[PDB]
Amino acid sequence: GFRKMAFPSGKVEGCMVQVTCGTTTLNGLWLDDVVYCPRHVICTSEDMLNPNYEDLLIRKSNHNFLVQAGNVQLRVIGHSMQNCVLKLKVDTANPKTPKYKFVRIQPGQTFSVLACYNGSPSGVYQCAMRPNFTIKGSFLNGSCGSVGFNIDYDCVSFCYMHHMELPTGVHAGTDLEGNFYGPFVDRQTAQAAGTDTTITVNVLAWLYAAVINGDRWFLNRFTTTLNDFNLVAMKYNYEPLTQDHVDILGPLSAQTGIAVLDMCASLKELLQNGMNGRTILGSALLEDEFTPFDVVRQCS
Amino acid sequence: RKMAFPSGKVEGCMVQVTCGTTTLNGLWLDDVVYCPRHVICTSEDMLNPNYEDLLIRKSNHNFLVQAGNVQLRVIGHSMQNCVLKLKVDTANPKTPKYKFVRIQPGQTFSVLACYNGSPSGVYQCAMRPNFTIKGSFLNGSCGSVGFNIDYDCVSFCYMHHMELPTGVHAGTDLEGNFYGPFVDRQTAQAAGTDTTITVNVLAWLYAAVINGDRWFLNRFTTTLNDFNLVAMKYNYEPLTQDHVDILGPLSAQTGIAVLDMCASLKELLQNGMNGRTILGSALLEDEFTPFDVVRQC
Ligand SMILES: *[C@H](O)[C@H](C[C@@H]1CCNC1=O)NC(=O)[C@H](CC(C)C)NC(=O)OC[C@]12C[C@H]3C[C@H](C[C@H](C3)C1)C2
Ligand SMILES: *[C@H](O)[C@H](C[C@@H]1CCNC1=O)NC(=O)[C@H](CC(C)C)NC(=O)OC[C@]12C[C@H]3C[C@H](C[C@H](C3)C1)C2
Numbered sequence: 001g002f003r004k005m006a007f008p009s010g011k012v013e014g015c016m017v018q019v020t021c022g023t024t025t026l027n028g029l030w031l032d033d034v035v036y037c038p039r040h041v042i043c044t045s046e047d048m049l050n051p052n053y054e055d056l057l058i059r060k061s062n063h064n065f066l067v068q069a070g071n072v073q074l075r076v077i078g079h080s081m082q083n084c085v086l087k088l089k090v091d092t093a094n095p096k097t098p099k100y101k102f103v104r105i106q107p108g109q110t111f112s113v114l115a116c117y118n119g120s121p122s123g124v125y126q127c128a129m130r131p132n133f134t135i136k137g138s139f140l141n142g143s144c145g146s147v148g149f150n151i152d153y154d155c156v157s158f159c160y161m162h163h164m165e166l167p168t169g170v171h172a173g174t175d176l177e178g179n180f181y182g183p184f185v186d187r188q189t190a191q192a193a194g195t196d197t198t199i200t201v202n203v204l205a206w207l208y209a210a211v212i213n214g215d216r217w218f219l220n221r222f223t224t225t226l227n228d229f230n231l232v233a234m235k236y237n238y239e240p241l242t243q244d245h246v247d248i249l250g251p252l253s254a255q256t257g258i259a260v261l262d263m264c265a266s267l268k269e270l271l272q273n274g275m276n277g278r279t280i281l282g283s284a285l286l287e288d289e290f291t292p293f294d295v296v297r298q299c300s
Numbered sequence: 301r302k303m304a305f306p307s308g309k310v311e312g313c314m315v316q317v318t319c320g321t322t323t324l325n326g327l328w329l330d331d332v333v334y335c336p337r338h339v340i341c342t343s344e345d346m347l348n349p350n351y352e353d354l355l356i357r358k359s360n361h362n363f364l365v366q367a368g369n370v371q372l373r374v375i376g377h378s379m380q381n382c383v384l385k386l387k388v389d390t391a392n393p394k395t396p397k398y399k400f401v402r403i404q405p406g407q408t409f410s411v412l413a414c415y416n417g418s419p420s421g422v423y424q425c426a427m428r429p430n431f432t433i434k435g436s437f438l439n440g441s442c443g444s445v446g447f448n449i450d451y452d453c454v455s456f457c458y459m460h461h462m463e464l465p466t467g468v469h470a471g472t473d474l475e476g477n478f479y480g481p482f483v484d485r486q487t488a489q490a491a492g493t494d495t496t497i498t499v500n501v502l503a504w505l506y507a508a509v510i511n512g513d514r515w516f517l518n519r520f521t522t523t524l525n526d527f528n529l530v531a532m533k534y535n536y537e538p539l540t541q542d543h544v545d546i547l548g549p550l551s552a553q554t555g556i557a558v559l560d561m562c563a564s565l566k567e568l569l570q571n572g573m574n575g576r577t578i579l580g581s582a583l584l585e586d587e588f589t590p591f592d593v594v595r596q597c
Pocket of ligand 2: 439440443
């Protein structure tokens, strides 16, 4: 009945290593003969306010990096920096390398996080990228380099690497090319995320899920244009819909026979009038962290 | 965050088991595959089975076990309560250190939901006081297992067998004994009245505080017995002194005494949340144990 369901993590567990500079240890991702990790592994507690990463890296050699899979050292044979990620070339190809891709996700998309410490997995959980490019994770000291991913058939799509916490308790990070999601930088400074908003496309997915399960009191007789809906949505701190959102609701629209813009008109009415005491899927609150793909998985 | 254990050690044990047109999942440990015995039923048999009768009519060769694209040869079979044990001629090199445990109501575990021998998703479950689990399971999910991991050791505690009309789920331990008053027959079965896992609600209120949510705290206090009277009135489980002790570390971390947090929960039960939320929830959450909360700090 709609659990937060993560992808099986084994294919990613088989790629996790630890990377140490000095006493600073974080996690890395070992794929083929390259290890990827956050570049702030090279910082000391004095570099961290505004590190000159290019200068810090010049002062490093291959022999300054301790890369371990469990207790077994992996020899580093080259090093480079790509945006905010370090790439360490190693002399061994990971025999557990899955089929994989590096992908950049959009806000509202969900993914699984394998939270790791010292290269060892602790737990797996499902996260949504918020519209302000933060995630509500569970991350302690030593969790950096933990990754987020989706799995399609045989293929692991890596989409997130963890780098930092914001003063509000939420989390920020990069894709596997080292480019931050959102307007954040890897400096130990207080950084503010944009005001967050509700993930409209996911709320619509949730409403389709309710219909699929026979809970449909909120369907009305009307429709809306996408532009009219977007202008109303923003007044309720809901994200505007994109053309890609309309398209990814296609399968659920087809399964239910309810056109996307008709469901938008139903959601608009819910926003303007409230639930009037009623519930949807046994909840007085609308859920915004299940995507249309996440619904289709658990329903059908 | 509801957090499951990493599922890799279990993924390496999942296989597909087929008898006739009935297919489900099995757990391959060393040279034995464990699976629900109703794999031997036709969909018709499932409506009311005599399992010993059905099993005597089966040979080793009626069981098709597949590990990916690779068929494993069954060389023996036996039934233990509601689980079938299929001896195969190949040992699983991916077998982790493991044990079989029977969990108590209120304890939590991770489920690796599987279809056709292939893992699909992982999530965290509590054994309800009425011995159901609020799972997410579809056709073909039987033989999926629940587990906890301690160090390198996988403790298997649940194997999935059925759904109830209310949409909750029922199954067995790895010795084949059901949790609760349920039977592996395709008939509508109701559970006993469920209750809320009080020690877990308290653990989660402490998690709300640790993450800076304190609107529900108060200065009232209570004795253990007076709290338990109110708890029971609201269909909450009694809190034992062992529960109070288990909460100690969380009490120390936050500096809120257990019975003080009991007084906050009493006020929530009597007054409600007044449209407010705790850790984003409009309802009190009871599927995090104290240990779950600590581990995640
Ligand atoms: C890498 O393991 C950690 C992950 C952090 C630790 C706790 N939760 C996390 O998500 N990353 C960092 O420690 C990171 C390092 C820099 C990018 C070089 N720094 C960081 O996350 O800063 C957090 C704070 C939050 C507020 C108080 C204080 C000063 C700033 C505001 C930044 C730390
Ligand atoms: C094994 O894969 C399935 C898992 C079930 C299917 C759907 N969701 C599940 O969790 N197990 C069975 O199909 C099981 C077989 C018996 C143990 C022999 N039968 C079952 O779960 O029946 C569920 C229903 C629920 C209501 C409608 C209908 C009649 C009864 C009430 C029992 C099926």
